[PDB]
Design a protein around this nucleic acid. Structure first.
Ligand SMILES: [Ba+2]
Ligand SMILES: [Ba+2]
Ligand SMILES: [Ba+2]
Ligand SMILES: [Ba+2]
Ligand SMILES: [Ba+2]
Ligand SMILES: [Ba+2]
Ligand SMILES: [Ba+2]
Ligand SMILES: [Ba+2]
Ligand SMILES: [Ba+2]
Ligand SMILES: [Ba+2]
Ligand SMILES: [Mg+2]
Length: 1030
RNA sequence: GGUGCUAAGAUUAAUCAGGAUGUUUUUGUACUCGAAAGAAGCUACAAAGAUAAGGCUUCAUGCCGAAAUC
DNA sequence: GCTTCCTTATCCTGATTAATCTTAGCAC
DNA sequence: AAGGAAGC
């Protein structure tokens, strides 16, 4: 308490409120808001989804390149330039089963099998070819109306079936005597069915990649998840200990016993007493929780024992050396023949590894050569799987090293682990967040520490540092209610396991074979029991015999899709048949159920849902929302990440204010107090503005010095307050973010509307005209300009003689879909033809927008440019032209940077940079001022009037409009629309988006940089040339 | 109040292994025109190619590219 | 040139490590 | 949300 200043922090996923106040005077010395959108770090799910998607399409292509190399070595084909892409590979995969195929014809049968090699956890070619013949289609997720009923097929088969089929084809071809060796057949089946292990990942011995096993340092890990194991609580360079290890079992039971309270001289047990119990249970075969307590009664009365962990339902529980007991059951070994650190090691190998090929490898590379026999590793493999429930329990918070120190002291001194430990006895934000793999938390952590390191730097050491926390303080009636639910959840788990075992065996438990390769049944079963054994989309029943023995037929569907909601809870989850899940797509049951070919009706869903008591409240809300959710609309992931980030700063601070003897108090406030206090104090929260972070932090810094005020509150409601608040934003300099919309667009030459000659038009298509979203789109184009539909122009027969007659004679009514009302009656609208022929009509392409700025991705094949659109920007280089006295803004995009051919570096070249300079309006003899990145700050001053406004940058918008820029407000997230600006800029557009051009005659622009606290300083001296150092 | 060991309930994150699509190019068949040859490139199915722009070297269970670093 | 408007690809299967909150027992 | 052509 050497100083008098108090610091408070309101740490979020996308903001950090800052606030300093004198605990004595009550003055507000500093209020500040640091803003870094969490949206960028949360995009990591998009990065991982696209990285794994890239690896799958890469390996699917490689599988057919290896096949091309196989056909050269075997000498079956040498010139691949004349292979025909127009035969029937499904028919060739049936002819080859009995009759002989050409080498070319065989290459077509195997390549087709390699491109779709099925899942892996009548041959397929015969099942497929027959779907081709009777339905006209194989691929994907489509509907069939057989036996007078609507059913749904998908092109999914097991890789064992494809392998079986492939092997039959190739042997039948061996009977016809070519270069089909037996090594040819083996190598092909490896291409077809070969797969990597989840614990090895990508690469080989030469392709070193730190995502996978073959590390770039040279190490070759046995398992890529071993390095992800947590570290010791107290020896941070010691890996944790398996909970099935001997050491962790020993430590846990001792700390269990020392916590007991028994009728003895010291009310606790003795060193000699511990040893007998440790020794008794180690040597007794069956050991439960209460059977151990009966043994404690002999060494004394069971109801006289106190101080023990309890079950959710009130049963007592205790450690049992269970792992150890079940290990003595090994016949080809004996745990008694092994010491501690080879028994501890056996739990490390059997816990991290879950499959045969992984256990066998770790036993060789961690245990000395010849320490295990092929007969002994056999039993251990079968032993690991037979007791996955015990080895799937994880890792102790302590390393072995720590317990080896804390175990003898646990025997002798009779104190529990915490008592023992005490007796024994500028923050680097990057080091604190080195091994925290959560870019949201790690960012919002690194930001909060970068502030105190900069607040101390300019305010000296603080008296106190307060941090709002997201915890609870439930009362006795409230704390009782929580465990009431927690028990009811664990009960309905086992209620479903019981319900499952009664209907599968009739017995009380389920065989452990049943959970191999299906670790998710205990949750699939819990949903099968909530839904009353019913599929909530088809209405068909779910039999645990199919749910267990043919679980391919089911998928766990997110009710409200994950792409929109990001709700990963149980309430957003149902167990339904697979084909029903795929037909649903990215929809809610409301949007989807009625328009599904195979399914219930929304009405029958509404019926079943509120006619059941086993379902949940939150699950009933989510199953029936008639709400048109979408992702472009004004989550639990945000609450977990806040608690995480806040706690890391709290712990890291108190630990820092100890070993460095700075001795600054580090206190804590809760959310219920600061929100109540906010009402009591003067808290008028401004609308949608970043002010409330800086003021919340001041309440945080004030709720501490509370015991010791009116001046401060008076000051808080001051007129001149929301004006003095400072704001600071984290600039985004990164290149190589998402470069464009993923949609691959086609273009055509046409004349539309007020057009004189040909013009390159980007196409759009209406994916489905039998939906109210697909019909609406049709009418919009139809009223505006019928000819936009490529059909009208290139097939007027179908338009004038099929579509217009349908538009006239069909209900249109609440609005309804005319095309759908035809589908129910006559089926899919068919293209015009004579003999009743003509294919179905499901989609309609039209001419939509003219081609403008794009990225070209046009095949060498194409008769038309194929392009990418909405090209995301990187930075803007601001120049000044002394002649005209105007500014000249050059815009760079993510897609202007490239990996260079020769060198391989990711960069942009002066040649390309100068070509962009040219077309952007920047004169080759103009002076560079500064570069603007995302969320840099501008100052824009009128020179005619000297009126000025502070903006923050978004990007350089509109390439046709030179020197145009989209800007964003200094104090809030976005503009309202119609907001007024300096005279020369006018008002913002009534949509919010402030898109103005900064190339006018008398305007002066200056770059503004700020620290993490909001200390602004002007810039114009950034350099001679722009920075392009890569 | 903070914190530790344990256990469970709830919710998340990081990373790996795979499936089936979707987008688009080309080709073939069907549909429309033509006596055919073919034309058209609409509409449907199928195959083949591309699939963030783009790069790597070690020639393959090949590797990297939408995060972080400010 | 300036402002208004339209638009934007997904559903799953298997596995491991880690984190936070909460309730319980014990302790500093 | 923000890229960027449409619409005037
Ligand atoms: Ba586990
Ligand atoms: Ba309360
Ligand atoms: Ba569309
Ligand atoms: Ba976009
Ligand atoms: Ba506590
Ligand atoms: Ba042609
Ligand atoms: Ba394809
Ligand atoms: Ba590529
Ligand atoms: Ba114009
Ligand atoms: Ba557009
Ligand atoms: Mg779904």
């Amino acid at each position: 308490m050497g100083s008098d200043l108090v610091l408070g922090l309101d740490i979020g996923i996308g903001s950090v409120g800052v606030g300093i106040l004198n605990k004595v005077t009550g003055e507000i010395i500093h209020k500040n808001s640091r803003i870094f959108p969490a949206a960028q770090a949360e995009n990591n799910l998009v990065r991982r989804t696209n990285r794994q998607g890239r690896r799958l399409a890469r390996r699917k292509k490689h599988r057919r390149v290896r096949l091309n190399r196989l056909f050269e070595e075997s000498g079956l084909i040498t010139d691949f330039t004349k292979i025909s892409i127009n035969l029937n590979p499904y028919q060739l995969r049936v002819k080859g089963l009995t009759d002989e195929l050409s080498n070319e014809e065989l290459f077509i049968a195997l390549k087709n099998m390699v491109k779709h090699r099925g899942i892996s956890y009548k041959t397929p070619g015969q099942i497929q070819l027959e779907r081709y013949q009777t339905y006209g289609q194989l691929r994907g997720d489509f509907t069939v109306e057989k036996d007078g009923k609507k059913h749904r097929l998908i092109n999914v088969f097991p890789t064992s079936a494809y392998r079986s089929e492939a092997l039959r084809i190739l042997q039948t071809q061996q009977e016809f005597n070519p270069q089909i060796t037996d090594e040819f057949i083996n190598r092909y089946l490896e291409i077809l069915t070969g797969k990597r292990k989840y614990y090895h990942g990508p690469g080989n011995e030469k392709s070193r990649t730190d995502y996978g096993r073959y590390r770039t340092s040279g190490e070759t890990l046995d398992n890529i998840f071993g390095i992800l194991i947590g570290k010791c609580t107290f020896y941070p360079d010691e890996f944790r200990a398996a909970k099935a290890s001997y050491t962790a079992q020993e430590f846990n039971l001792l700390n269990d016993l020392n916590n007991l309270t028994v009728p003895t001289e010291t009310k606790k047990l003795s060193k000699e007493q511990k040893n007998q119990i440790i020794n008794y249970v180690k040597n007794e075969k069956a050991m439960g929780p209460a059977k151990l307590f009966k043994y404690i009664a002999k060494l004394l009365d069971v109801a006289d024992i106190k101080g023990y962990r309890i079950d959710k339902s009130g049963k007592a529980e205790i450690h049992t050396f269970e792992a150890y007991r079940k290990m003595k059951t090994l016949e080809t070994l004996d745990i008694e023949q092994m010491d501690r650190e080879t028994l501890d090691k056996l739990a490390y190998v059997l816990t991290l590894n879950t499959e045969r090929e992984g256990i066998q490898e770790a036993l060789e590379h961690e245990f000395a050569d010849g320490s295990f026999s092929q007969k002994q590793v056999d039993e251990l493999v079968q032993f690991r799987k037979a007791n996955s429930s015990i080895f799937g329990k994880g890792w102790h918070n302590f390393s072995v090293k720590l317990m080896m120190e804390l175990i003898p002291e646990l025997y002798e001194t009779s104190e529990e682990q915490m008592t023992i430990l005490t007796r024994l006895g500028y923050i680097d934000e990057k080091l604190l967040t080195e091994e925290i793999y959560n870019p949201v938390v790690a960012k919002s952590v690194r930001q909060a520490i970068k502030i105190v390191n900069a607040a101390i730097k300019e305010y000296g050491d603080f008296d106190n540092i307060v941090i709002e926390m997201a915890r609870e303080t439930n009362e006795d009636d409230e704390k009782k209610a929580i465990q009431k639910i927690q028990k009811a959840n664990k009960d309905e788990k086992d209620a479903a396991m019981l319900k499952a075992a009664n209907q599968y065996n009739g017995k009380a438990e389920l065989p452990h074979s049943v959970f191999h390769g299906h670790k998710q049944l205990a949750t699939k079963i819990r949903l099968w029991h909530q839904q009353g054994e019913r599929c909530l989309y088809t209405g068909k029943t779910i039999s645990i015999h199919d749910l267990i023995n043919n679980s391919n037929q089911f998928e766990v569907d997110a009710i409200l899709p994950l792409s929109i909601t990001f709700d990963d809870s149980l309430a957003n989850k149902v167990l339904v048949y697979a084909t029903a899940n795929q037909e649903k797509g990215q929809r809610t049951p409301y949007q989807a159920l009625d328009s599904m070919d195979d399914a219930w009706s929304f009405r029958e869903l509404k019926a079943f849902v509120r006619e059941s008591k086993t379902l949940s409240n939150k699950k009933k809300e989510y199953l029936l929302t008639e709400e048109d959710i979408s992702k472009f609309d004004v989550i639990e992931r945000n609450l977990v990440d806040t608690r995480y980030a806040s706690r890391v700063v709290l712990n890291a601070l108190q630990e820092h204010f100890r070993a460095h003897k700075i001795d600054t108090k580090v206190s804590v406030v809760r959310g219920q107090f600061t929100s109540q206090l906010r009402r009591h104090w003067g808290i008028e929260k401004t609308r949608d503005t970043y002010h409330h972070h800086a003021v919340d932090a001041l309440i945080i810094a004030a709720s501490s010095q509370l015991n010791l005020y009116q001046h401060f509150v008076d000051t808080l409601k001051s007129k001149e307050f929301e004006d003095s608040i400072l704001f600071s934003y984290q600039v985004d300099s990164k290149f190589n973010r998402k470069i464009s919309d993923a949609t691959i667009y086609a273009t055509r030459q046409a004349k539309v509307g007020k057009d004189k000659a040909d013009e390159t038009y980007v196409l759009g298509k209406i994916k489905d005209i039998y939906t109210q979203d697909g019909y609406d789109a049709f009418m919009k184009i139809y009223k505006k300009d019928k000819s936009k539909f490529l059909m009208y122009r290139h097939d007027p027969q179908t338009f004038e003689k099929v579509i217009e007659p349908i538009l006239e004679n069909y209900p249109n009514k609440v609005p309804c879909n005319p095309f759908l009302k035809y589908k129910e009656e006559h089926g899919y609208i068919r293209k015009y033809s004579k003999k009743g022929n003509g294919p179905e009509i499901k989609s309609l392409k039209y001419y939509d927008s003219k081609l403008g700025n794009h990225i070209d991705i046009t095949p060498k094949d194409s008769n038309n440019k194929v392009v990418l659109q909405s090209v995301s920007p990187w930075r803007a280089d601001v120049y000044f032209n002394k002649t005209t006295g105007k500014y000249e803004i050059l815009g760079l995009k993510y897609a202007d940077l490239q990996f260079e051919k020769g060198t391989g570096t990711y960069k942009i070249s002066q040649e390309k940079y100068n070509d962009i300079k040219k077309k952007e309006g920047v004169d080759s003899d103009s002076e560079f001022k500064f570069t603007l990145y995302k969320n840099d700050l501008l100052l824009v001053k009128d020179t005619e009037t000297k009126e000025q406004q502070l903006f923050r940058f978004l990007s350089r918008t509109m390439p046709k409009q030179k020197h145009y820029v989209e800007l964003k407000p200094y104090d809030k997230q976005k503009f309202e629309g119609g907001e007024a600006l300096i005279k020369v800029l006018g008002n913002v557009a009534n949509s919010g988006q402030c898109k103005k051009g900064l190339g006018k005659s008398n305007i002066s622009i200056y770059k503004v940089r700020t620290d993490v606290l909001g200390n602004q300083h002007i810039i114009k001296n950034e350099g001679d040339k722009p920075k392009l150092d890569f």
